[PDB]
């Protein structure tokens, strides 16, 4: 809403301030060309300094949802949503997100009627095994960029309201401010669900005078 908030001067908070002073302050007509021009810089800064990394990043190399494969997208989702230390999904809504994506992959790459390869989302408690089994059932998806329909579906179910906001930026567009700013508080207390478990990525609200 534009209200002031005091936060610790972390790398993520400094990125927040830089985007506030260079991107978010721009008008609507200037927002989209600016994001197109500074796509690479924004992606690098999100992947390096922010709690919500650029989603299309495989092996540390910036990509796009269109230039990413289904296996890469599923692996990225597991990496960013499933916590290895606790050996469980951070949120059931996130587990449902990943399972719906896998169901869509199965729909895309199945040639005819078949039983779902993931009957219950509880099978995703071992997400590596689930991904292995589904992408062995449909090996063509391992080396196949995302269908554009599937990209649109991915963005829509990232925008799903009855769901915890995803811990990444899927695309840079008019809704980039929403993706960047929404759900920025829980990361302080749940550093285990951060890329490097680093506070500098997360933003912690604090008082400049009370910090003495």
């Amino acid at each position: 809403m534009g209200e002031p908030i005091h936060k610790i001067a972390t790398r993520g908070v400094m990125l927040w301030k830089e985007f506030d002073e260079t991107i978010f302050n721009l008008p609507k007509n200037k927002l989209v060309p600016t994001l197109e021009a500074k796509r690479d810089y924004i992606i690098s800064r999100l992947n390096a300094d922010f709690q919500k990394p650029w989603f299309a990043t495989v092996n540390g190399q910036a990509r796009d949802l269109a230039t990413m494969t289904y296996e890469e997208v599923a692996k990225r989702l597991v990496e960013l949503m499933f916590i290895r230390s606790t050996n469980s999904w951070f949120d059931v809504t996130w587990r449902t997100f990943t399972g719906d994506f896998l169901r869509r992959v199965e729909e895309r790459f199945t040639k005819s009627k078949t039983l779902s390869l993931i009957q219950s989302y509880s099978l995703l408690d071992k997400p590596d095994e689930a991904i292995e089994k589904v992408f062995n059932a449909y090996p063509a998806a391992r080396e196949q960029f995302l269908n554009a329909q599937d990209i649109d579906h991915f963005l829509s179910m990232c925008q799903n309201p009855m769901q915890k906001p995803v811990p990444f930026v899927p695309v840079l567009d008019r809704r980039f401010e929403i993706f960047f700013k929404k759900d920025s508080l829980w990361q302080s207390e749940h550093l285990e669900a951060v890329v490097d478990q680093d506070v500098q990525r997360t933003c912690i609200l604090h008082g400049p005078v009370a910090a003495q």
């Binding site: 169901r103 869509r104 199965e106 729909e107 895309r108 790459f109 199945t110 040639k111 005819s112 009627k113 078949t114 039983l115 779902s116 390869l117 009957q119 269908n147 329909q149 649109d152 579906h153 829509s156 925008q159 799903n160």
Partner: protein, 138 residues
């Protein structure tokens, strides 16, 4: 005692690039003396092809030629070519929908139902058929 999810095929249209076999396999068929013999600058290769015809694109025409009927991908491509189904992304009747919709009624249509809903129309208005004055200015 009180009170299995089924998955449906979805159209994944492939460009049908040539299969690139392993080098040993591709070398076995050709003569061993061809290596370095030809002037590749003087060898002409068809790197791309396409068409627009009575059965849509080269893909759909090939499907009708070889198998005599459209697969899911071919039927969805023909419906898209003929404008039967348009793509929609965004809110639709309140709930958010992303996929094919009927061009006229705008109602969601699944790839499963594309065949059952448009196979007759595609067959009746594709290929050799009675001349349609609407396609040739009355």
């Amino acid at each position: 005692n009180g009170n299995q999810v089924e998955i449906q095929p979805r159209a994944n249209i492939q460009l049908d690039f040539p299969e690139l076999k392993p080098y040993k396999q591709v070398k076995q068929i050709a003569p061993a003396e061809l290596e370095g013999l030809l002037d590749l600058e003087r060898v002409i290769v068809v790197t791309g092809f396409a068409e627009v015809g009575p059965w849509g694109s080269a893909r759909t025409r090939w499907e009708m030629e070889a198998f005599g009927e459209f697969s899911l991908e071919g039927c969805v491509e023909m419906a898209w070519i003929m404008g039967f189904i348009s793509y929609h992304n965004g809110n639709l009747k309140g709930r958010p929908y992303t996929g094919w919709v009927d061009s006229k009624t705008k109602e969601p249509v699944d790839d499963k139902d594309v065949k059952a809903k448009y196979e007759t129309s595609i067959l009746e208005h594709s290929g050799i058929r009675l001349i349609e004055p609407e396609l040739f200015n009355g």
